[PDB]
Amino acid sequence: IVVAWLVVEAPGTGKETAPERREVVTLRCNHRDASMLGSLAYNVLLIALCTLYAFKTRKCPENFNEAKFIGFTMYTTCIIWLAFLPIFYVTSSDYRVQTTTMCVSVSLSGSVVLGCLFAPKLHI
Amino acid sequence: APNEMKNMQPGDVCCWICIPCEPYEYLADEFTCMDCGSGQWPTADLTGCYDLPEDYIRWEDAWAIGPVTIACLGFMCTCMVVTVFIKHNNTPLVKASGRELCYILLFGVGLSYCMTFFFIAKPSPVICALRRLGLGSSFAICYSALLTKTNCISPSSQVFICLGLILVQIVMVSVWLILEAPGTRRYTLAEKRETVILKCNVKDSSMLISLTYDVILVILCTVYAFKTRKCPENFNEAKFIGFTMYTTCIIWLAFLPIFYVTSSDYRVQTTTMCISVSLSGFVVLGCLFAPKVHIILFQ
Amino acid sequence: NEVKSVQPGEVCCWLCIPCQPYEYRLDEFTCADCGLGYWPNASLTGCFELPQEYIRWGDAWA
Ligand SMILES: CCCCCCCCCCCCCCCC(=O)OC[C@H](COP(=O)(O)OCCN)OC(=O)CCCCCCCCCCCCCCC
Ligand SMILES: CC(C)CCC[C@@H](C)[C@H]1CC[C@H]2[C@@H]3CC=C4C[C@@H](O)CC[C@]4(C)[C@H]3CC[C@]12C
Ligand SMILES: CC(C)CCC[C@@H](C)[C@H]1CC[C@H]2[C@@H]3CC=C4C[C@@H](O)CC[C@]4(C)[C@H]3CC[C@]12C
Ligand SMILES: CC(C)CCC[C@@H](C)[C@H]1CC[C@H]2[C@@H]3CC=C4C[C@@H](O)CC[C@]4(C)[C@H]3CC[C@]12C
Ligand SMILES: CCCCn1ccc(N2CCC(c3ccccc3)CC2)c(Cl)c1=O
């Protein structure tokens, strides 16, 4: 699906100008941040299916039961992205802030996934 | 034309050259362009700035459609929870452990649901004072009830200590309010003189420290829940309270940096406050009452 | 700098006024604009610009 979205468009990185800021010029990708809304929806559906299946592995032995360690991860990721979206909307400073915010969000999401999934197993 | 465009004489009175000055500057004299007060726009005749009406309030619109819908959904959810608690749980021993405490917690959650209606309304000194006091009062009620729940895992003493923990926060909020209740004033934005935003000018930072005092309370409740989750209270609710504590910790730790970052935009001020309050209320109600109603319907 | 001198009434003297800062192409009698993305601040008579989005290995935010 992302290739089908990618094939239609093409890498068009180039300088961009703003009417209210002419002394500074910046270059970025030619695709808007809303282009991956389909991928976001697909991931949301995948998370919903994961939660639904976790709701069915409830009555399982502790070794095979993880309905108290992966349900948190979906909620934590949802909170992370629903907090990143307003910051992205309000900042609108293409030079630095969006790169830092996205990198921090991705790194912390990976960290929370690791801590919720394997850190209890490493502890054992 | 005199449309905000003044004329200078190069070297003779008879000859003049007309050059437009700033659009926000008016003509005090024929040969002078001068700025006027903030929040006022120059008139077409360029003789005197007229005060722009304060129509930039958070009126009901597409932005406001979300918070009110979430508020009414939460009101329906808490009404259903309250009627289930009062219908098929008063006489059974399931709800006998924390009946009054759960009821006052539900009242606090309902007031927090009204809090989004307080936020969305137009600013005024009385409504600003009421909103500022409630923002501490409702959450103090909720988390004092949560802390008493944690300590339970005698009822009169618990109720009295919860009331005292509520009253100390009430007194702190009262002194904060007697400091500067009204706070109402005009707001001026650089390079945005066309738009004048009418909002309560009480410090967002001062509201932030009030919220972080309540956050220190949250952390106390969360560490207590994490300490006491090891031994259940024979009803398997200590772990549920602990999970609620961690989820609210997550919500607040999300809410503080985003608010600090977006302190500029007043619409995002009005929206994120409501979103966070509604999410906290939804998650606490779910994680603390959904298993209760599930076991009630199963039995 | 940033001021253009014009003398319509007479040649004896001119009433120089500062025009927009983003137009500095000529700067002898009238100020003219330059191309998009080119700041007219090179040799007081030309336009130049520097690339951005190169904060790789930057101490400020990277
Ligand atoms: C509207 C905002 C949020 C609303 C409500 C949030 C739901 C809870 C928040 C954190 C999840 C932890 C679950 C509580 C643990 C417990 O108490 O029990 C856990 C129970 C069952 O496990 P168990 O019975 O075996 O006991 C375990 C003993 N330790 O849940 C489940 O695994 C059921 C499967 C998950 C279904 C709901 C999960 C929702 C996550 C994503 C939803 C999207 C929200 C988007 C918000 C922006
Ligand atoms: C998967 C489900 C549970 C997510 C629910 C998210 C809800 C609570 C919130 C999160 C972000 C919110 C959106 C944020 C911004 C806008 C733009 C505004 O002009 C209209 C409302 C709208 C579109 C909001 C609607 C409600 C919203 C979608
Ligand atoms: C897990 C939760 C807390 C994540 C919330 C969203 C992420 C993207 C938040 C968490 C803390 C935030 C940072 C907090 C403070 C600042 C300093 C400010 O001058 C620029 C924005 C910046 C650098 C924020 C960027 C966005 C940020 C990294
Ligand atoms: C996404 C928005 C609408 C919020 C919806 C939250 C719902 C789906 C969640 C929140 C809390 C959840 C409950 C939390 C704990 C338990 C106890 C467990 O033994 C069975 C599932 C049960 C009863 C969950 C069912 C689903 C539940 C009610
Ligand atoms: C809940 C599922 C999480 C996984 N996830 C999260 C975000 C995500 N983005 C696509 C769109 C996002 C975005 C879109 C518009 C404005 C701001 C931001 C930015 C990045 C993907 Cl593509 C993903 O897959």
Side-chain angles (χ1 to χ4, degrees), chain B residues 72-75 77-78 80-81 83-86 88 90-92 94 96-97:
Chain B
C72 65
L73 190 150
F75 267 110
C77 279
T78 187
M80 171 275 258
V81 161
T83 195
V84 164
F85 197 87
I86 207 173
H88 211 159
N90 295 328
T91 55
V94 160
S97 65

Side-chain angles (χ1 to χ4, degrees), chain B residues 102 104-121 123-142:
Chain B
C102 281
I104 69 180
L105 173 80
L106 284 179
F107 164 69
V109 172
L111 171 64
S112 83
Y113 282 142
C114 314
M115 185 63 72
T116 187
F117 286 140
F118 293 102
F119 291 166
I120 191 167
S124 79
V126 65
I127 208 165
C128 186
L130 190 60
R131 160 204 296 168
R132 202 150 85 256
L133 66 90
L135 192 42
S137 297
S138 77
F139 292 165
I141 295 281
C142 295

Side-chain angles (χ1 to χ4, degrees), chain B residues 5-11 13-21 23-28 30-31 33 35-44:
Chain B
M5 182 179 72
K6 74 159 168 173
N7 50 2
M8 294 298 102
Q9 274 84 8
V13 289
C14 295
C15 299
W16 60 88
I17 177 65
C18 297
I19 44 170
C21 51
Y24 74 92
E25 287 190 303
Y26 80 111
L27 311 183
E30 294 293 328
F31 301 102
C33 283
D35 53 353
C36 54
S38 315
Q40 299 176 348
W41 197 250
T43 316

Side-chain angles (χ1 to χ4, degrees), chain B residues 38-39 52-53 57 123-129 131-132 181-184 187 197-198 200-203 266:
Chain B
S38 315
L52 283 165
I57 57 182
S124 79
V126 65
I127 208 165
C128 186
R131 160 204 296 168
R132 202 150 85 256
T184 302
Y187 184 41
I197 291 142
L198 168 65
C200 204
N201 288 116
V202 289
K203 280 73 176 175
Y266 79 99

Side-chain angles (χ1 to χ4, degrees), chain A residues 55 58, chain B residues 73 240 282-283 285-288 290-295:
Chain A
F55 194 15
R58 213 183 60 237
Chain B
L73 190 150
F240 286 4
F282 280 170
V283 71
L285 272 195
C287 190
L288 183 62
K292 296 191 52 53
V293 307
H294 212 177
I295 67 180

Side-chain angles (χ1 to χ4, degrees), chain A residues 17 22-27 99-100, chain C residues 22 33-35 38-39 49 55 61:
Chain A
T17 65
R22 210 181 191 275
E23 62 270 355
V24 58
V25 65
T26 47
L27 73 165
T99 46
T100 61
Chain C
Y22 46 83
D33 204 359
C34 200
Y38 276 93
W39 205 228
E49 203 75 27
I55 53 164
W61 292 120

